[PDB]
Amino acid sequence: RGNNGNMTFNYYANTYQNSVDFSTSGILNPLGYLK
Amino acid sequence: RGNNGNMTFNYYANTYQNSVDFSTSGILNPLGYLK
Amino acid sequence: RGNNGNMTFNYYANTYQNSVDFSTSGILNPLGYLK
Amino acid sequence: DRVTTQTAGNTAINTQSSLGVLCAYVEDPTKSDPPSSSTDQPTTTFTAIDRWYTGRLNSWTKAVKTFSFQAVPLPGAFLSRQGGLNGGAFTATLHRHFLMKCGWQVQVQCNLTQFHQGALLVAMVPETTLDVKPDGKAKSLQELNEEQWVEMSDDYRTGKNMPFQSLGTYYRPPNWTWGPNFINPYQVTVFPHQILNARTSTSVDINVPYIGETPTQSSETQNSWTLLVMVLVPLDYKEGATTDPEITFSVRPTSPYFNGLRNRYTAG
Amino acid sequence: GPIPTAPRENSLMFLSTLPDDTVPAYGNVRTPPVNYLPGEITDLLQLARIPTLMAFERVPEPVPASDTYVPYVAVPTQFDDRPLISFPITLSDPVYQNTLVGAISSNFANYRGCIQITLTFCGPMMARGKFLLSYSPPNGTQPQTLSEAMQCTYSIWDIGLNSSWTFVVPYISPSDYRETRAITNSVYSADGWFSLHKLTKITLPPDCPQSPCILFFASAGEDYTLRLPVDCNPSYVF
Amino acid sequence: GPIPTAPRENSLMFLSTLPDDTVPAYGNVRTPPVNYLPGEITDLLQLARIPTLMAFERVPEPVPASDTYVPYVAVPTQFDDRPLISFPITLSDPVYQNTLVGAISSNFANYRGCIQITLTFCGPMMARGKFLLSYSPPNGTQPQTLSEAMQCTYSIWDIGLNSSWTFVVPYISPSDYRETRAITNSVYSADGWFSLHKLTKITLPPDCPQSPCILFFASAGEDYTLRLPVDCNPSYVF
Amino acid sequence: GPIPTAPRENSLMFLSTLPDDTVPAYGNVRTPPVNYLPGEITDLLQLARIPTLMAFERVPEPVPASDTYVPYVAVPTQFDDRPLISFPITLSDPVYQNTLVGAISSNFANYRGCIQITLTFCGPMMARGKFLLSYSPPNGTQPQTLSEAMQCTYSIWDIGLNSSWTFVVPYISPSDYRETRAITNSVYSADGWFSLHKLTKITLPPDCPQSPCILFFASAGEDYTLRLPVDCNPSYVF
Amino acid sequence: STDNAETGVIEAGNTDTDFSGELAAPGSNHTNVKFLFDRSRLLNVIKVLEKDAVFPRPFPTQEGAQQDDGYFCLLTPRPTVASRPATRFGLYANPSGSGVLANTSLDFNFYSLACFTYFRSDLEVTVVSLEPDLEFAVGWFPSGSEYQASSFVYDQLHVPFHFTGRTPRAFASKGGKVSFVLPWNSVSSVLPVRWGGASKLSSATRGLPAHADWGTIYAFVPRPNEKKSTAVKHVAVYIRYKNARAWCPSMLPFRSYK
Ligand SMILES: [Ca+2]
C-alpha cells in the first residue's frame, strides 16, 4: 500500500504504474536467531 | 453525515479521508437523570 | 424535470440539491368548475 | 421518598427532605473502566476511601448579593483542606500517585426554615479556574475566609480575569477583553445541579462521572469538576429568625483509579 | 484515452459551505478512543431544552453594583391592575439574551414550535397566593388589565407544596416558521406578549419577610426547532 | 490515480439556458408544505385557454377619457355591405395585445393550432338578429363584401336565448408552425382575417335602447400550442 | 459527449504528502529480482526494538580525547545515598540521542508504549553486589534517596552467573500518546526519571580490579509504537 | 403545569400539556452538531515568509529578541497569542506605542455556539491569498511538533529547510488557492473548549492547555532567500470542522445589556 488512500480505481496497468521483477523460472519477524 | 450531500462515491479510503480511533480490545436522550 | 437534460447521474443527494417540504404527518385540469 | 440515608464505608449521610439524586449524563455515573493510557496495574477503590468526607463553606447572610458564589475544586479542596476537608487515606493515596481518575457524589447541606426565603444554585461545573486569582495563584484558606463569597462581576462574566501568561517586554501589553473560562450566571443551570430553595429542602445531591480531555489526569493539577454554590435569590427573614445559616458539604470519590505510584508529592 | 470534460463557469470557486469533502493531506492516523467520555451532545436542541434564567432590569431602584439585572421578580404588596412583569415573544429581546434558548436561537434565522417559561416561587413556605400567567398573540395594543389577560391564553398558578409552574407559549403563527431576530417588526418576528399578574395578593403570617421573589426560566418546548444557521454576533469579545 | 481528461474549447463558459444543475451552497433545508394551496398551474396553456377580452378603437368618436379602446362593438342601425369589424389573424396585432392568449403567445416564437373567438351579445333580451362571422386565409386583397365573406370559412349566428357564440379559427398553414410575431409580413406570420358582418339588421320593439353591443373574447383552442421561449418586451414598465 | 465537471478551489495544487500516485513516464520496465537478498525490513520498529548503547558524560574527569561520552557507568567504591546515574524519561534527552530508539523516535511526533533499559555488568566474574533500578513518574522534585526510589516502580538486580538485567519503563501517562520531543516541558513530553542506585556495595576478592562498569542499552518495548512522521533535523551534516 | 425546578430536571412540554392543541411537526435538524460546525470560517490572517524564519520564543519574551512575528498560525478555535496557546483573548484598542503588537485569534463563531466542554473533529484547512496574483505555498507541522529552521545552499542560493520535510507542503498555482483536510492529531483525546487544569507541576498557568490544536500552518514564497521582496504579503486561513463531536453541556458567552 504505502501512503496511498486510493481504494477505488487504477487507470494505468500495474506493469506501467510500477516496475515488476522479471522471473527466473502485524507479525514482525526477528532479524537475528540464536542457535 | 454532517454538511455533506455526496451520496455517490468516496475516492479515498475511510482511514485516509478521516481519522479513526484505535482499538483497546430523532431520539435525543437526557443529559441528566433524577434518581 | 424542467429545463434539465441530465438523465444519467445526480452527484448530490436530493435533499441537498433541492429543498423538500417537511411532513405534517398531457392532462391539463380546469381551474374552474360550474356546479 | 424524601427520607434517605446513603451509606459508604463507615459513613452514612441522612436527609429528610431529599429531592432525589441528580445523576449527570448517565443513569449510573459510577460505572467506569481503567484508563487506557497507563499500562501499570492501577490501585482501585478500597474500603478506607469508599466514603463521604465532610467540610464547611462560608455562611449565607442577607448581605450576599445575587450571583455571588463559593467554589470547591475537586480534588483540589482535598489537597488544600479547604473548609477543613481532610481526605484521610484518600489524600494520602492521591499524594502518592501521578495519575488519578474518578467521579464524585456530592451533597450540600443548608437548612433554613419555613419562615426564611432565598435560593442557592448548587452545581457541579466542568473545567473551571474559579479557585484561582487573576494573578495565577490559588486562593489561600485565609483569602477565602476574608472574602467569604466572591461577587459576580464583569471580570468573571467575561473571563477577562482568568490566569494567563504575561507576554514580556518585547510585546505591547494587549487589552484583555474575554476568556473561555467565563461564567454566564444566567446559564449555570445548564450543568448538573439542584436548587436549594429555603422553602423546599435542606439539602441537594448530585452524582457525576469522570470527565477529562484525556483518559486519566495528573493528581496534583486536575480540576475537571468544581462544586459551585451561587445565590439566585437573596436570603431574607424577619428579626428574631436565626441569622447567617451555615453551609456544609459532603463529597465521596467514586470508582477511583490511581496510576503511577511514587514517593509523596513534593513541590518543586 | 482522455475523457472529454466541460468544466463549468464556477470552476476553481471556493464555497465555504460546499456540502462535500476535500483531499486528505496526512492520512492513516488513528486517534485515542473517546468511549470513556460521557455526556456526548448530538444536537444543540438538547441544550436549548434545558431551562436557564431570564433577566429583568431591577425595578427603577438598582443596587450600587452596575448592570443591575436580576433573574427574578419581587412581588410587591400594593395592588395594581397591570402586569407585575411582561415581555414580548420575540426571541431577540434582551430578556432571552442570556438564556440558552435565546443564545442558541440567535444563531439561526428561524424557529418553529413552543417556547417554555418556568416559574419558581422562592418566598417562604408559609406564604400563599395565586398568579395569572397569560400569553397574548399580537394586538394593536399590548394588554395590561387582568380582564384583558384573562381573555387570552392563560393559566392560574397556586402557591403551595410544589414550588414551580411551567407555562408553554403556544406556537400561533401565520407562517410555518418565524424569524428568530426582529430586525424589522412584523407578525413574523414578534408574536405578542407574555405577562404575569398577581391574581390574589400574597398572604403571609406575622414575622415573615415581605416581597417574595419568583425566579424565571426559559427553554425550548418539546416541539421547538431551529432552521438556517446564520453568522454570529462577535460583540461578546468587545 | 488521476483520471486523464481533455477539457473542451468551451470550458468555463456560462450558458444561461444550460439544461443542467449547479452546486448547492446551503442544503438540507426543509420547506413549509404547500398542499393547503389550491389552484396550482402546470402549464401556461391552461391560462391561454381562458377567454379574455379583445380591444378595438372606438369608432372615430372617442370619449373625453384618453386611450379610448373598448372590448365590444356596437351594432349600428344603418345598412352597409362591409364588415362591422375585422382584424388579422396575426398574434402580434394590437387587438390581441391584452388578451391572455396574445400576451402569453408574444413570449414564444411559434404557435400551432386553433385560436378561438367568442362573442357575447349584450343587447336587450327582446332583441333579435343574425350575424355572419367569417375567416379568410390570406388573399391579395382583404374581403369586405358579404358575398366574399360567405365564400370563406363562416358561420351564421342567431341571437336568442343563449347569449354567446364561439368561433374557432382553423389552423390553415403551409408550415407546421407559424410565427407568433409579424416582424416581417409573410404567409408564415399573417394568416388572413376574421370579420363580423351583420346578416339581418337587429330588430327591436318600441322603447328599447338602440345599438346593442357585442363583447369579443379570444383564447387558445384545444389544440393550440406554443414553441420556443423568446426574450420579453420590457416596455410595460416604461 | 463531454462530461460536465467542476474543478475545486485547490486545483493544480502540489501536495507533497498526497496519498495517491501520479502518471508513469517510462513504463513496462522489469527489474532484477531481489529474492536472493535476506534481511528485509518491513517496519522501523523492528530496529527500534534492537537495544543499542546509551551515552553519559564521563564523571567530571574526562580523557584527553575530546567529546568524552561513555556507554557505561563505573561503580564507585564510596558510599553515597543518591543515584549512581539518572536520566529523564524524555525521548529527546541526549542520553537517547544515539540509540536507535531515540534516533528513530525523534523522527515522529508521538510514541505510546514501553521503553526498555538493559543493563550488562562488565566487571570480573568474582564480583558480587546488588543494584536497585527505579522509575519515578513526574513529581515536583526528582527523587534522590534510596528511600524515595524504593517507593516508585523498581526492581533489585543481583550480580551473578547471568550478566544482564532488562528493565521495562511502564507507560504511565494521562494521554494515550506522548510527545517524542520536549519542545516545551509538560506532563505530556517529560515522564519522570529512571535512576540506578547501588543497593549493597560491590564486593571483590583480593587482586581484582576496582570500579566495575555497567553497560546501558535502550530499546523499544514490545508494545512501543510511533505516530506522525515529522521533518528531520539535518544538523548531522554540519 | 405543577413542577419543582429545584430537582434539576424539568420536562419540555407542548401546547396540549395544560392547554388544548397539538405538537408542531419538526422543521429541521440544523442544530445537529456534525452538520452545524461543518462549514468554513476565517481563523486568522498571517504574513507570508520570504526566508527561513525564527519561530517566536516562549513567554515572557524580552526586548531585543530577534524573531519573526505574525507568520505562524496555531490551528485552534481557542484564543491564541503570537502563534501560541492562550487563555485570555486580547486586541489593541490603542495601536499606538512601543513594542510588538502580538497577533491574536479566536474562532468567534465557534465560541458563540460552543455550549459544551469538550470537542473533537478533523480539520479542513483552506488558505486564500489577500494579495493580487500571488504564488505561495503552505507548510504545516503536527501538534507537539515544531518548525524546522535554517536553510541549505544550492547554487549559492539559500533555500529554507521549510521547502522540504515529511509533513504536508502545498504549492498553489499563481493566483490559486490551497485546500486539504487534517486529522485530529493532538496527543489529547479531545479539545477542551474551557479547561481547569495545568500542563506542568511547576510554574504553570492554570487553564492553559498544552496541545489543544490541530498543529500549526505557515505560508511561504517558492523562491530562494536572495530573491526576497520588501512588501509584506498576507494570506487568510480558513478552517472547517469535519465529523464534529461535542461533550458535557456548558455556557455560551455573556451578552451585555449596555
Ligand atoms: Ca477537469
Q: Which residues of H touch E180 (CB under 8 A)?
A: none
Q: The cell 470527565 sits on which residue?
A: D211
Residue E208 CA, ligand 1 centroid: distance in Å: 81
C18 touches chain B (CB under 8 A): no
Determination technique for this entry = X-ray
Can you tell me the distance from the alpha carbon of D200 to that of E161, in angstroms, rounded to the nearest whole number? Answer: 8
Q: Output the nine-digit C-alpha cell for G13.
A: 495544487
Q: Which residues of G touch A6 (CB under 8 A)?
A: 19-21
Radius of gyration, alpha carbons of chain E: 24
Alpha helices of H44-189 — where are they, by DSSP H? 108-113
Q: Which residues pair with G168 in a beta bridge?
A: G116
DSSP state of H25: P
Q: Residues G118, G219: contact at Cβ < 8 Å?
A: yes
Report CB contact under 8 Å: B3, H243.
no
Q: The cell 429543498 sits on which residue?
A: C19
Residue F105 CA, ligand 1 centroid: distance in Å: 42
Residue H180 CA, ligand 1 centroid: distance in Å: 18
The amino acid present at E104, given as its one-letter code, is I
Fold annotation for D1-268: Jelly Rolls (2.60.120)
Mark which residues 101-120 of H lie under 8 Å from D by CB. 101-102, 104, 106, 111, 115, 117-118
Nearest chain F CA: its distance from E155 CA (Å) = 31
Structural domains of chain H in order of their starting residue, each with its CATH number:
1-258 (2.60.120.20)
A8 touches chain E (CB under 8 A): no
Mark which residues 153-182 of D lie under 8 Å from E by CB. 154, 177-178
For residue E216, give the chain D residue with the closest CA. Answer: D186
Radius of gyration, alpha carbons of chain C: 17
Report CB contact under 8 Å: B6, C13.
yes
Number of domains chain F contains: 1
Which three-class secondary structure state does DSSP give residue G19? coil
The amino acid present at G184, given as its one-letter code, is T
Q: Residues H27, C22: contact at Cβ < 8 Å?
A: yes
Reported as type and span, the H/E element at residue D24 is: strand D21-24
H122 touches chain B (CB under 8 A): yes
Can you tell me the distance from the alpha carbon of C18 to that of B32, in angstroms, rounded to the nearest whole number? Answer: 38
Measured CA to CA in angstroms, residue E90 lies from E152, G120, G158, H198 at distances of: 18, 79, 80, 43
Chains D and A touch (3+ CB pairs under 8 A): no
Can you tell me the distance from the alpha carbon of F128 to that of F200, in angstroms, rounded to the nearest whole number? Answer: 9
Nearest to E220 among H12, H23, H33 (CB): H12
F35-44: which pairs have CB atoms within 8 A and are 24 or more residues apart?
F35/C21, F35/C24, F39/C31, F41/C31, F42/C28, F43/C28, F44/F104, F44/F226
Cβ atoms within 10 Å of F162's Cβ, excluding its own: 9
Residue D9 CA, ligand 1 centroid: distance in Å: 72
What DSSP string runs through F42-109? S-THHHHTS-EE--EE-TT---SSSS-EESEEE--SS--SS-SEEEES-TTSTTTTTSHHHHHHTTEE
Can you tell me the distance from the alpha carbon of E56 to that of E68, in angstroms, rounded to the nearest whole number? Answer: 9
For residue G16, give the chain A residue with the closest CA. Answer: A3
Q: Which residues of G touch D262 (CB under 8 A)?
A: 136-137, 139, 143, 151-153, 192
For residue H28, give the chain F residue with the closest CA. Answer: F30
Nearest chain H CA: its distance from B5 CA (Å) = 11
Report CB contact under 8 Å: E94, H257.
yes
Q: The cell 417537511 sits on which residue?
A: C22
Cβ atoms within 10 Å of F41's Cβ, excluding its own: 10
Half-sphere exposure of C24 (CA within 13 A, CB side): 8
A5 touches chain E (CB under 8 A): yes
Residue F2 CA, ligand 1 centroid: distance in Å: 11
Half-sphere exposure of D22 (CA within 13 A, CB side): 29
Cβ atoms within 10 Å of F32's Cβ, excluding its own: 13
Can you tell me the distance from the alpha carbon of G176 to that of H187, in angstroms, rounded to the nearest whole number? Answer: 7
Can you tell me the distance from the alpha carbon of D223 to that of D225, in angstroms, rounded to the nearest whole number? Answer: 5
Report CB contact under 8 Å: H192, D192.
no
Q: Output the nine-digit C-alpha cell for F121.
A: 351579445
Q: Which residues touch E154 (CB under 8 Å, ≥6 apart)?
A: E132, E133, E134, E135
Tell me the count of A-B CB pairs closer than 8 A: 12
Q: Residues G152, G145: contact at Cβ < 8 Å?
A: no
Name chain E's partners: 3 or more CB pairs within 8 A.
Answer: A, B, C, D, F, G, H
Q: Output the nine-digit C-alpha cell for F168.
A: 374557432
Determine how β-strand F5-7 pairs with β-strand E3-7. parallel
Q: Which residues pair with E219 in a beta bridge?
A: E116
Range F191-201 burial, b when 16+ CB lie within 10 A, else e: bbbbbbbbeee
Measured CA to CA in angstroms, residue G45 lies from A33, G91, G98, G101, G111 at distances of: 17, 15, 16, 8, 11
Can you tell me the distance from the alpha carbon of D83 to that of D77, in angstroms, rounded to the nearest whole number? Answer: 8
Residue G10 CA, ligand 1 centroid: distance in Å: 12
Determine how β-strand D4-8 pairs with β-strand D193-197. unpaired
Q: Report the phi/psi class of residue D93: left, alpha or beta, with left for phi > 0 and alpha for psi in -120 to 50.
A: alpha
Report CB contact under 8 Å: F28, H30.
yes
Angle, alpha carbons D252-D253-D255 (nearest 5°): 130
Phi, psi (rounded to 5 degrees) for H192: -85, 110
For residue B24, give the chain G residue with the closest CA. Answer: G176
Chains A and F touch (3+ CB pairs under 8 A): yes
B18 touches chain A (CB under 8 A): no
Nearest chain E CA: its distance from A23 CA (Å) = 30
For residue C23, give the chain H residue with the closest CA. Answer: H25
Q: From E195, E132, E138, select the one nearest E172 (Cα to Cα).
A: E138
Measured CA to CA in angstroms, residue A3 lies from A6, C32, D99, G19, G23 at distances of: 9, 68, 37, 5, 16
Resolution (A): 2.3
For residue G174, give the chain E residue with the closest CA. Answer: E32
Q: Output the nine-digit C-alpha cell for E231.
A: 453568522
Q: Which residues touch H81 (CB under 8 Å, ≥6 apart)?
A: D167, D174, H90, H102, H103, H104
Q: Which residues of A touch E24 (CB under 8 A)?
A: 5
Q: The cell 464534529 sits on which residue?
A: H244
Report CB contact under 8 Å: A17, F2.
no
Which three-class secondary structure state does DSSP give residue H112? helix
Can you tell me the distance from the alpha carbon of E71 to that of D234, in angstroms, rounded to the nearest whole number? Answer: 11
Q: Residues F215, F105: contact at Cβ < 8 Å?
A: no
What DSSP string runs through F144-167? -SHHHHTTSEEEEEE-SSS-EEEE
Q: Residues E51, E220: contact at Cβ < 8 Å?
A: no
Q: Residues H60, D165: contact at Cβ < 8 Å?
A: yes
Q: Which residues of F touch A9 (CB under 8 A)?
A: 1, 3
Q: Output the nine-digit C-alpha cell for F21.
A: 444543475
Chains B and H touch (3+ CB pairs under 8 A): yes
CATH of the domain at E142: 2.60.120.20
Half-sphere exposure of F163 (CA within 13 A, CB side): 11
Reported as type and span, the H/E element at residue D142 is: helix D141-147
Phi, psi (rounded to 5 degrees) for H112: -70, -15
Q: The cell 501568561 sits on which residue?
A: D165
Measured CA to CA in angstroms, residue G86 lies from G187, G210, H172 at distances of: 18, 22, 49
Helices vs strands, H then E, count in chain G: 3, 17
Q: What are G's interface residues with E at a Cβ cutoff of 8 A?
A: 1-11, 15, 17-19, 175-177, 227-228
Q: From E115, E118, E57, E97, select the one nearest E182 (Cα to Cα).
A: E97
Nearest chain G CA: its distance from D166 CA (Å) = 17
Can you give the residue range of the structural domain that contains G56?
A: 1-238
Can you tell me the distance from the alpha carbon of D158 to that of D181, in angstroms, rounded to the nearest whole number? Answer: 8
Q: Output the nine-digit C-alpha cell for E122.
A: 422562592
Q: Is H1 exposed, middle or buried (0-12, 13-18, 19+ CB in 10 A)?
A: middle
Q: Which residues pair with H216 in a beta bridge?
A: H74, H141
Residue G115 CA, ligand 1 centroid: distance in Å: 50
Nearest chain E CA: its distance from D241 CA (Å) = 8
Reported as type and span, the H/E element at residue E129 is: strand E128-136
Helices vs strands, H then E, count in chain E: 3, 17
Q: Residues D22, D192: contact at Cβ < 8 Å?
A: yes
Q: Which residues touch G155 (CB under 8 Å, ≥6 apart)?
A: G132, G133, G134, G165, G167
Nearest to E2 among F5, F13, F28 (CB): F5
Q: Residues D72, D250: contact at Cβ < 8 Å?
A: no
Q: Residues G182, G102: contact at Cβ < 8 Å?
A: no
Report CB contact under 8 Å: F2, A11.
yes
Phi, psi (rounded to 5 degrees) for C24: -105, 0
Tell me the count of C-F CB pairs closer than 8 A: 49
